[PDB]
């Protein structure tokens, strides 16, 4: 079965998410990523339209895995006695946004605008599909270096999108909102906008704004790099302490800083090639 269908290459990475290997689909030589997740480590379980017991990650990936290239697509999955195996698409050449920022430093605003816009479109796709990611951050964003296209990865901390309060959270603390830190309660969309504010600051400053719980709660934004007034305004808006004071996705995309975005191919030509 799986073992004959795929040629296993080297280990790409491992962590909280499991172990991911580079691979090639034997039928058409297609580049793939093979992700292994131990059953004993899966806390959130769900069921497909048929009713098979699978990790929540598989449920969420199927709901979002269609035509749009802003989310990494689930090609297939397999159940083993003690693990689940996920076959994912693999761009080549690729680099995650964390590694990209680490190597190149703070991004030019034209580049951050293109990247941030693409993340916003990917998050809107997830929400339209009834999926909440819950771990939007530089490490969970892949850059397709040839096309200048960004892809969201790791739906392992995600949930089905709902309009009621969430009282559980297992994403990244430094990207978590003050309402979670203080009350252990948040609403999906406004918590997503907070994490987007953390991500934008990270792109234009080269590092995250807050380290400690006290800083998150105070929510005072200091700029360590030269950043335009419009970009600073948008960041401070996404990072409003009161969830109801944060912009909607529409308000972010209509912001003066978000106007005249480059197309992904133009972005690769100017900044990546
Ligand atoms: C280096 O290429 C990849 C490709 C895909 C992934 C991935 C996708 C999801 N949902 N988790 N991990 C990681 C690395």
Curated annotation (Swiss-Prot):
It catalyses: L-seryl-[protein] + ATP = O-phospho-L-seryl-[protein] + ADP + H(+); L-threonyl-[protein] + ATP = O-phospho-L-threonyl-[protein] + ADP + H(+). This is Serine/threonine-protein kinase pim-1. The keyword GTP-binding does not apply. The modification Phosphoserine is found at residues 66, 229. Expressed primarily in cells of the hematopoietic and germline lineages. Isoform 1 and isoform 2 are both expressed in prostate cancer cell lines. Proto-oncogene with serine/threonine kinase activity involved in cell survival and cell proliferation and thus providing a selective advantage in tumorigenesis. Exerts its oncogenic activity through: the regulation of MYC transcriptional activity, the regulation of cell cycle progression and by phosphorylation and inhibition of proapoptotic proteins (BAD, MAP3K5, FOXO3). Phosphorylation of MYC leads to an increase of MYC protein stability and thereby an increase of transcriptional activity. One of its GO terms (biological process) is positive regulation of cardiac muscle cell proliferation. GO terms for cellular component: cytoplasm; cytosol; nucleolus; nucleoplasm; nucleus; plasma membrane. InterPro entries: Kinase-like_dom_sf, PIM1/2/3, PIM_Ser/Thr_kinase, Prot_kinase_dom, Protein_kinase_ATP_BS, Ser/Thr_kinase_AS. Changing residue 36 to Y: Increased kinase activity. Residues 6-258 form the Protein kinase domain. Induction: By interferon-gamma (IFNG). Strongly induced in leukocytes by the JAK/STAT pathway in response to cytokines. Induced by different cellular stresses, heat shock and cytotoxic agents. Belongs to the protein kinase superfamily. CAMK Ser/Thr protein kinase family. PIM subfamily. Autophosphorylated on both serine/threonine and tyrosine residues. Phosphorylated. Interaction with PPP2CA promotes dephosphorylation. Ubiquitinated, leading to proteasomal degradation. It comes from the Eukaryota.
């Amino acid at each position: 079965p799986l073992e004959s269908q795929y040629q296993v290459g080297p280990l790409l990475g491992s962590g909280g998410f499991g172990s991911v290997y580079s691979g090639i689909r034997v039928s058409d030589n297609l580049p793939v990523a093979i992700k292994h997740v131990e059953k004993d480590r899966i806390s959130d379980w769900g069921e497909l339209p048929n009713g098979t017991r699978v990790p929540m990650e598989v449920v969420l990936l199927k709901k979002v895995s269609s035509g749009f290239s802003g989310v990494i697509r689930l090609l297939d999955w397999f159940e083993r006695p003690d693990s689940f195996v996920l076959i994912l698409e693999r761009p080549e050449p690729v680099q995650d946004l964390f590694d990209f920022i680490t190597e190149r430093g703070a991004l030019q605003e034209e580049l951050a605008r293109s990247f941030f816009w693409q993340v916003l479109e990917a998050v809107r796709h997830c929400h339209n599909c009834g999926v909440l990611h819950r771990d939007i951050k530089d490490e969970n964003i892949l850059i397709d270096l040839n096309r200048g296209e960004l892809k969201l990865i790791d739906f392992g901390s995600g949930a089905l999108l709902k309009d009621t309060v969430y009282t559980d959270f297992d994403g990244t603390r430094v990207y978590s909102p003050p309402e979670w830190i203080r009350y252990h309660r948040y609403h999906g969309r406004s918590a997503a906008v907070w994490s987007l504010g953390i991500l934008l600051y990270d792109m234009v400053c080269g590092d995250i704004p807050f380290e400690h719980d006290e800083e998150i709660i105070r929510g005072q934004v200091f700029f360590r790099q030269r950043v335009s007034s419009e970009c600073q305004h948008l960041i401070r808006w996404c990072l409003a302490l009161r969830p109801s004071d944060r912009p909607t996705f529409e308000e972010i995309q209509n912001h003066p800083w978000m106007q005249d975005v480059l197309l992904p191919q133009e972005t690769a030509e100017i900044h990546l090639h």
